[PDB]
Amino acid sequence: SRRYDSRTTIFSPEGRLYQVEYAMEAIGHAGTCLGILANDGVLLAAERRNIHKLLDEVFFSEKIYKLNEDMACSVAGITSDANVLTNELRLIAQRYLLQYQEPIPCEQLVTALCDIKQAYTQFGGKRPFGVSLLYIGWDKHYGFQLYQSDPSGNYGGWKATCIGNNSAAAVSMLKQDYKEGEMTLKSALALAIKVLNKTMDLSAEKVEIATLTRENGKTVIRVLKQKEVQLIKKHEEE
Amino acid sequence: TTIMAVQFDGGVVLGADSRTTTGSYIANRVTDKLTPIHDRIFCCRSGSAADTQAVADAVTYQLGFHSIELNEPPLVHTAASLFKEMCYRYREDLMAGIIIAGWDPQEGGQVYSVPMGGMMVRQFAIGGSGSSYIYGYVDATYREGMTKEECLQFTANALALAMERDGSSGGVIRLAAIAESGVERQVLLGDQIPKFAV
Amino acid sequence: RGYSFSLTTFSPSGKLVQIEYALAAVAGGAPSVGIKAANGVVLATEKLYDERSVHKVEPITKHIGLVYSGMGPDYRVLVHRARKLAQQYYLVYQEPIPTAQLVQRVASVMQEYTQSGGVRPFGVSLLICGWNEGRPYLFQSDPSGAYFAWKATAMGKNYVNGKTFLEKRYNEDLELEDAIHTAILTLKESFMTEDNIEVGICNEAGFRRLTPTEVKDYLAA
Amino acid sequence: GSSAGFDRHITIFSPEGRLYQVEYAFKAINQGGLTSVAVRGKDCAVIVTQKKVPDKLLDSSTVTHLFKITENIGCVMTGMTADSRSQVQRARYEAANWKYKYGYEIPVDMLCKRIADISQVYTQNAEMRPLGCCMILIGIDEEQGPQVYKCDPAGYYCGFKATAAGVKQTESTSFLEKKVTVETAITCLSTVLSIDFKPSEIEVGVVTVENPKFRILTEAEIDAHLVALA
Amino acid sequence: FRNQYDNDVTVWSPQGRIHQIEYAMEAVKQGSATVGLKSKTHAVLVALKRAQSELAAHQKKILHVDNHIGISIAGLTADARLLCNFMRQECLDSRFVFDRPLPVSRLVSLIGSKTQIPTQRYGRRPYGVGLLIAGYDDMGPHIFQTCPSANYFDCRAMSIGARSQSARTYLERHMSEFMECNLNELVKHGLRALRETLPAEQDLTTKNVSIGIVGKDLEFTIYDDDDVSPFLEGLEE
Amino acid sequence: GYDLSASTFSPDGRVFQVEYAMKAVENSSTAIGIRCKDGVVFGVEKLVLSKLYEEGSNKRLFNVDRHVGMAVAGLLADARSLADIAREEASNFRSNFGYNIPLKHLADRVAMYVHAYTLYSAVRPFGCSFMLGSYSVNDGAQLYMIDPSGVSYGYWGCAIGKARQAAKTEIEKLQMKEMTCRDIVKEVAKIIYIVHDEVKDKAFELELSWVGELTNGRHEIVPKDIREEAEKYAKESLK
Amino acid sequence: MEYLIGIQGPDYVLVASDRVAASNIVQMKDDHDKMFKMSEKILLLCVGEAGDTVQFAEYIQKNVQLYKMRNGYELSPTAAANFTRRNLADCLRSRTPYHVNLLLAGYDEHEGPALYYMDYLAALAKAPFAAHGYGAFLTLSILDRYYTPTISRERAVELLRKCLEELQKRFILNLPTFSVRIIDKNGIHDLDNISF
Amino acid sequence: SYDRAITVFSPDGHLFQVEYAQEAVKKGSTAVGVRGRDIVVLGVEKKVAKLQDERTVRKICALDDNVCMAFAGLTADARIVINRARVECQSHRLTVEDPVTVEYITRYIASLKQRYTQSNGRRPFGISALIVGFDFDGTPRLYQTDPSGTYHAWKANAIGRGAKSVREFLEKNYTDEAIETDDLTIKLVIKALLEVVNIELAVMRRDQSLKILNPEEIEKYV
Amino acid sequence: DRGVNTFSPEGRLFQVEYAIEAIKLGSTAIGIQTSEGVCLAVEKRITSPLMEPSSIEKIVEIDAHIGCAMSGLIADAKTLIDKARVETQNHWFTYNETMTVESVTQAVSNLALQFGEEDPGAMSRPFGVALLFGGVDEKGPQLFHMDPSGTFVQCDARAIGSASEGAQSSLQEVYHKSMTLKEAIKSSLIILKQVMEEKLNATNIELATVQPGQNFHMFTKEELEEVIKD
Ligand SMILES: *[C@@H]1CC(=O)N(CC)C1=O
Ligand SMILES: *[C@@H]1CC(=O)N(CC)C1=O
Ligand SMILES: [Cl-]
Ligand SMILES: [Cl-]
Ligand SMILES: [Cl-]
Ligand SMILES: [Cl-]
Ligand SMILES: [Cl-]
Ligand SMILES: [Cl-]
Ligand SMILES: [Cl-]
Ligand SMILES: [Cl-]
Ligand SMILES: [Cl-]
Ligand SMILES: [Cl-]
Ligand SMILES: [Cl-]
Ligand SMILES: [Cl-]
Ligand SMILES: [Cl-]
Ligand SMILES: [Cl-]
Ligand SMILES: [K+]
Ligand SMILES: [K+]
Ligand SMILES: [Mg+2]
Ligand SMILES: [Mg+2]
């Protein structure tokens, strides 16, 4: 029925996609999430929106998802939509490995998912996914990498970026502090705490940090324990 | 298998042997080959046990639903028609020779043959591998205007004769009488089965 | 035939109003309580009627149970799907589905109805309890398809008051016998016989509804 | 009682989480202007409904709200007539299909659950309307004894000691509550309507533990009850 | 009080009408006039053909369907060809299967059944075309009229199109003598009726008149241009 | 604005699209059916909109099976499609079950088809009501009527169209149960002439059909000679 | 029958194939080429059923080229070999099986030279040397006898020449000329045809 | 599936969804193409952060060995069109055994875009493209496609934000003297961009494949 | 909002009306039919000197004996032109003969009105283009016009596009049945000259003929210059 159809996949008179823009509004109200590239690894730092005292915490992470052996990601927006998309990312990665018997290069994984998101903006008359994702990974082509995708299916590579709440304020701090080509993981960690310190309105229970490194020709993805997240104490001295 | 049904004034008599064979091994010696399809409608099954059980179950479903919709006891001819439609449509996939017999208030006692190929004819009827051996007997013995008791005897005798000659027939004789008053079932076993000297 | 367009869309401020309105149906529902103890989980809910004819506390498998707040008929759909998802898992893996895996699959179904054509979201939130890996689990699944693991929670009418009540009267070391007691008291805050409440427990021996006799005994305390 | 967008036209949620189209379907039940009552005892379950034949040119034998679903399950329908008949056909289908697949008669609770689950779909999918009718089922269960079940356009269902549907539903519920089987059902309906019936003015259906087959009482059978109650 | 009831063919108005069907019927009124009439032996179609300018050909109005059936059209040209193709196919199918011509009344029934379907389905529209159907079969000559409403009529004579009301007036006045007319007299009756639709200044010419004839011993034949001269020659002003 | 779709209830629980379709029936001229001792008779007031039409054009009486007649009021294109539905249903029944469809079952089946068009925005309700009539020795005479909502009842006498209430008043005066079809055709002709609004609508053809013991259970048009006798009787009765 | 041969050295792969296209009792072409360039450093050599060979090989070719255009870099030999196998194995039980036998030869910057053997059933094996055709029956033992992993390109060519001479001597089919190519870090190089 | 007619005619013969697609193009970064004597040059505006990886976000892309394109508008839509064209270039090499002509692939891209203006359930592509390369006889080519599916060949052209101003600059500046050498051909593109503008530039020469210029080499021209 | 297949109260399809309006946004095309052949002339309408005039193709060959001039939304016409080309080749394949100009026009017009949201992804709207088909068959030289409605008709002389009303007036004055082809070429160039916005030269117009003698011929730049000189 033409009466009830909200027409989610049309252009506005200015050549805008309203559903995409309203989806990006949703993301701006989601937990802060940032990623930083260094010379010896990549990291993701996320604000936990959980926060409640009576929560159980059954998983190893809440906002950081492993995608394959060499890749993880984090999300900002509708949680349920993120679950659909991250499942799909795992499927694409496995489909590539089946076919080529090598891991999917990071950009190829991002492009494949963005094609799905783009499709939702052009046909099918459905609402788009209200998710921005940060992807971290290593491949044999470009080494350590960081990507960001948004609801329209646009993506870009970054040395450092932020999505979610107060991301504009975060991107400002990154431009000032990020030493291009001179960042280690230890200094990147420091900068992450420093950025989350300003944008978040800090506790170890309120943040989640994952690092991606190479050890003996093999990728290691680990979520830092509460004790390691010592990093908050190291900043307050500065 | 030998199956048989006879019309009388006011109902029908059905009969079958009870032998089910795989090759020349008797897998079931007390098979029940008279299957009720409704209150006063039965079928006698011969051929593939898989096929006749599946077709019977399907018709029971169809006739049961039909009967509720119409709010009346079903016609025997309708039961026969439902068998014929399935047996004809899937003649290349079925190995089924059916006799449909029963009573309805409209037409009384009726016997229908639905042989392999799925033609339908009102008739008494005989079927199964064992029926070859009793064509001469039934042709010589049948009389118009037989009572119910005479039909039971006629059926018991014919089946007994077929059971003696046909390796694929044997066991007990299952008999059913169907009339307005209902269904009466009995089994003939051992000495109860009519005997003929060698 | 059916509508191919979404009935849930983003508003200018980035909200999905149908999901929020679905949560209003949940919050208007009868109160439900879930408490994870050290050696079990307990689910409790408020209810001419034959009270034994329909149940709100429902088994999914031998080790998983469920209760809800919101729209009863929507719940029955998800109960059927959950049971089906649990069997499909068992057929493949020949192992009872972990509670977390069941929640994820059910939440995925709930997500579908926020995006698929010509449908509204479910007007229910679920409390799922389970026992696997010698460990109890309590999850909540909301109309959007978001799920959370809880030590204890409440949903439905007066859930806000129920939650702060639990925050005061719940410790981690509490065992199952005591957890049932405090769950009943939580419902008593916004209410009682063994005919107008339903209680389910979950431990090593699996998931079962408490019998009306068993409930009558706990009310004597 | 706030509204937004098309929440009164299709089954989407209103701001307070209501389904207006579902609520309007309950109003549709009353457009019939009839009331039905069902009660169960230890020995039997009974359905009684009004039979209004205003025309005279009607063949009154074809004017009924009592339906055989199976040999052992009867029902009374309240609400929109054509919607009602459609739900009866579906019930008959579900019951026949159950027997075929599972090799035993569908329990009354299961048939009611199935019809309710079907109705739920109409409350969630925007393109069709809910049925403006109400189904009450009676039957004997082997273990539980006589059963009375009711489902509604919202997809709710329940078993009852006694229940009612239609215009005087609330008044009937009041009467039946104060009392807690054939005599009870007729008396309840007579009180809430203030009629005092002729045998041609009501329909009665029964299932008993001794006679599980659903039975519709004749005019003479109903009279013997009305004469006894007098 | 009509705006929301007139966009969809699936929407009944409070007065028990369907506006889209009525609007579709306006489309045939916008078409140029055509006349059909019959005797006991012949069925004849006569049609006025429009031309946008002097340098353009006059648009075809009469179409062959089978040896025993022809049609005249009024309304959407594209709907007319879509319906003509369906009709041709039905006739082919009949001859293929039964080796005999499709009875005219059976074809018209098929048309009504076909054109009714879109009047009841959302997002569909009625056929914006009216037909006069001339045929001859075992039951003799026939003139049928089909409507966007999917209704159809068995006619002694009929006229549809613009200003056809005055053609209908002529036909009623003279229809008592149609049955007994020879072919020449029957065509002239059709031409006279069609001439009533014209403004007082305008006249029937060989450029604007199209004639179709089917009868007892004559296959459906269309006459245009030089071929219509014999029929016009014996006409009184 | 609750009256645009059959998939929409109004706040008072009405489906206006069905009601609007019923209005289309109410604007149609009258058809009546009367069940008598040994059959069913149908009559239709068929309005003559033009003298150009053939005598017999726009029939409102149909054979849907050899033993089943159908009388219609409303949008005629919709009625014709329902006649096809009914024919197909009778045809399919014979193929599957191997006998003539009982009238009650045919009515139920077609009514459920009619009903299916009252649920959805995708389609609109039929703008027609119709009567089904049949006779056999086993079943006797039966007359059913179906309306746009999909309601189906059996009748001793029935009327549809604009003068339905006025027609029923006349029909109620008959003891139809005791009368033969021969007497009923005259009464049907009479009632049509009574309810005919001579001032508002001019010119009508009377259309008559019957099924009974006298036709050996076959639905047929009333013979011309009997029809003319009925017309003369109706005309002289009206004074 | 068609002949394929590959010899992997320390930093190169040498490949050769016959140049005959046969039909019944006649050679129809004596300058046939059975090698397909997949990328700058990959050759696919394909023999088997008529139609199937060129259809399959050109399908893989266009897909390997599409990968490069989409991603800005080329498939590694190992990735290309597995891609090829996936496609052939996927079609094995379909309505469209391909009756082809393949060698894939390639040089990777990080992995060095590689030679892959694949039969029509789509079993894939990495080998230091391999051959397809009836000719393989007469030449594989010569390779086994003389091959060492450190064989120079000069010696590989002479070892190839030994195999080809054996075909001239002992093989019942007339195979007079052979395509010869080498792949290394600098890409694919056309060597002189070996002729008799 | 979804069958709503999205692109429809409005009362003056306008296709509003196509016109709105053309507005999406104007929100895109400026892209300039100049066809020289024996060279074709593409240049694009880059609006970019310091923290961004330059390689990932490029508006100049190779379709085949002999064909590349630049785009303005929705970047997601562009990726879809580019990959569709890349598949088509391979299908052509497969079936005709020749590389695509610049005109063939343009025609393909244009007809794809046109289809999305007349298909149910879809909105038009919100990009314009400049497509460059050489034919078999070594003739340089520059084509433009837009959302409607119209395509034309140009000596020089601009698309995206402030395309009208750049076009009017090129009209006055595109002479024989300006395209006499390869250095002056590149210069004209940079001048055209500096008229509305941090710039990315790519060159394609006769049978020599696409070469992207370094930031140090672009800084020399500025 | 309304559907694509909605009638106006006047009995017109809105979308078809609007598509005919879009022809008026198109450049002028002229066709003249003589006994010596048919000629087609079209205004290119160059919008920039940077645009290559030869990349504007508004006269195309359908087959050796049929040409086609277009006006309106040019991108829409390409799929119609392809249908015409394929159909002529299909006819040759099957019947081993050339397809008549009328038959080609008829086949193309079959596409029109085949739009609607009832799959999946079929035509959503009519084509916003008008076509002149000019060719030679056994009936001699013939010119046909087809518009977005799918109506086609034979024309002695026809103009389409923005300035067609004025051009048609000029055509009706100058055209005669015994007129030669060389006259027709000059006539249409004179008419194009006066109705064009830009000054007519050899680069901003297209001209093509089909004659009984020879195949479809597109006039070269040099051939256009010769015709203009006068
Ligand atoms: C159905 C009927 C009943 O008593 N319950 C619990 C309140 C239901 O949900
Ligand atoms: C149907 C009946 C009628 O009067 N018209 C207009 C001439 C139709 O098309
Ligand atoms: Cl992996
Ligand atoms: Cl069954
Ligand atoms: Cl047999
Ligand atoms: Cl048999
Ligand atoms: Cl047998
Ligand atoms: Cl035995
Ligand atoms: Cl839709
Ligand atoms: Cl279930
Ligand atoms: Cl339980
Ligand atoms: Cl009409
Ligand atoms: Cl008219
Ligand atoms: Cl190539
Ligand atoms: Cl632009
Ligand atoms: Cl025009
Ligand atoms: K034996
Ligand atoms: K609904
Ligand atoms: Mg079998
Ligand atoms: Mg093969």
Numbering used by the authors:
A (entry chain P): 2 to 202, 206 to 233, 235 to 243
B (entry chain b): 1 to 123, 125 to 199
C (entry chain O): 3 to 49, 55 to 198, 202 to 231
D (entry chain U): 4 to 183, 194 to 243
E (entry chain S): 2 to 238
F (entry chain T): 6 to 244
G (entry chain X): 1 to 196
H (entry chain Q): 2 to 48, 50 to 199, 205 to 229
Paper's wording?
The eukaryotic 20S proteasome (core particle, CP) is a barrel-shaped structure created by four stacked heptameric rings. The two outer rings comprise seven α-subunits (named α1-α7), while the two inner rings are composed of seven β-subunits (β1-β7). Each β-ring holds the catalytic sites with three different specificities: caspase-like (C-L), trypsin-like (T-L), and chymotrypsin-like (ChT-L) activities are displayed by the β1, β2, and β5 subunits, respectively. In the latent 20S proteasome, the channel leading to the active sites is closed by the N-terminal tails of the α-subunits, which point inward to the center of the ring, blocking access of substrates to the proteolytic chamber. Here, we presented peptidic activators of the 20S proteasome, which were designed based on both the C-terminal sequence of the yeast proteasome activator, Blm10 protein, and the interactions predicted by molecular modeling.
